[PDB]
Symmetry: C2
Subunit: 244 residues, 2 copies
């Protein structure tokens, strides 16, 4: 149960706006975006409120004013990763302005890999909707696709992470599809990194939520790139080693 979730989102956005006008990205600014990231975890109605309360404007403003604040970018892109999981909200992200930001951030080195990873996750859910959903002229879909492949291959698979998942369902939904091989690749990489580095936390979660048959299905899939099948097999092996 809950109270007024709308007042919570608005209070955070008002705090962010005040810190923007103060031109100050301190622990309070970072906390407010972290709070939004946290409260949008598997909570689509909070994602919708962030957009409906002009949150994207504050996102863009903060990117412009604080281009070197790495933790800020991590928190903002974590929030947008949650927004991007809600299919009904993804059309709001399909603007040349927003897509260029997400594509540019694929090359971010901020907070290790977290900004690049979170931007790749946003784009993975966007590309899952197919070329019909891509109504943007700049950049072109296939350019962003290549930037996504290059981003994923650039990340250390043994990276320690500043992100937590309570469920893999949004990531698992990217596996049984041939619409967007790059989205399936990002999802498979996400699972592989997390079971490799944090098996005690994430192997039982992946097993309980049915990840194993989905990954074996990838290995038998024609539209799946060879690199995706290789990673899927390694996730199965890691999870099997954990079960033993």
């Amino acid at each position: 149960g809950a109270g007024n979730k709308m007042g919570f989102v608005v209070t955070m956005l008002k705090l962010i706006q005040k810190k923007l006008l103060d031109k100050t990205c301190d622990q309070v600014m970072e906390f407010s975006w972290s709070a939004l990231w946290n409260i949008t975890d598997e909570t689509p109605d909070n994602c919708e409120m962030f957009l409906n309360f002009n949150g994207m404007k504050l996102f863009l403003d903060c990117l412009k004013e604080f281009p070197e604040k790495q933790e800020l970018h991590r928190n903002m892109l974590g929030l947008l990763g949650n927004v991007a999981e809600v299919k009904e909200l993804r059309p709001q992200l399909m603007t040349s302005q927003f897509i260029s930001v997400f594509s540019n951030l694929l090359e971010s080195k901020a907070d290790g890999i977290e900004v690049s990873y979170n931007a790749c996750g946003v784009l993975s859910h966007i590309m899952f909707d197919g070329p019909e959903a891509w109504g943007v002229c700049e950049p072109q879909r296939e350019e962003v696709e290549e930037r996504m492949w290059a981003a994923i291959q650039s990340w250390d698979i043994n990276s320690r992470r500043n992100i937590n998942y309570r469920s893999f369902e949004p990531i698992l939904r990217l596996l049984p599809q041939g619409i967007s091989p790059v989205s399936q690749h990002w999802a498979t990489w996400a699972l592989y990194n997390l079971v490799s580095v944090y098996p005690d936390k994430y192997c039982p979660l992946l097993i309980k939520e049915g990840g194993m048959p989905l990954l074996r299905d990838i290995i038998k899939m024609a539209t799946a790139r060879q690199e995706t099948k290789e990673m899927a097999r390694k996730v199965i092996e890691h999870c099997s080693n954990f079960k033993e």
Copy 2:
């Protein structure tokens, strides 16, 4: 996905403690408890962190220092309602001190019915675990039971509400059981109030989550009190009228 949820809980508890030492229950104090209520919605790990960070001490302190602050009590008991849904955490609530607080609050008139309702929900999940779980001498289980029946029957079924549900699953789990008839009664009342006053929001949620067969099962149940079956039938009728 999410970031550091632990820092969020701790920051709220630190804000609450500072307002306690200032002896000030203002909008900031109320917001901090509302934030905890909101972030514990269907989120057991946040409930566990609240308890592990000495949250119950702050709860008791605030009840003592601010006995007439109605919105504060609503928010605090909403948070505890979320904690009480987590079976692994309910043993922490089984102390004479805590049970007496929840039982006393059944007669609260604060914020309409919200404090009484939230305290009754806490006790409904506690009593769902059976008499074996009741290790408290004062008060006795059957006294609290009677206070719960009297509370539920005192509430206007047409009450407007200051609570939101994103799922009825914790309430529905109280229906198919004969361990605690009063818990089943509270759960049935909760559904009846919400489909009566907010059918556009809650009839589709109850229907989608399988509430109808559960309520019909109650009508066929021997351990179910007649008043519970009457309410269950009315919920079915309201939901059927809505479907038509």
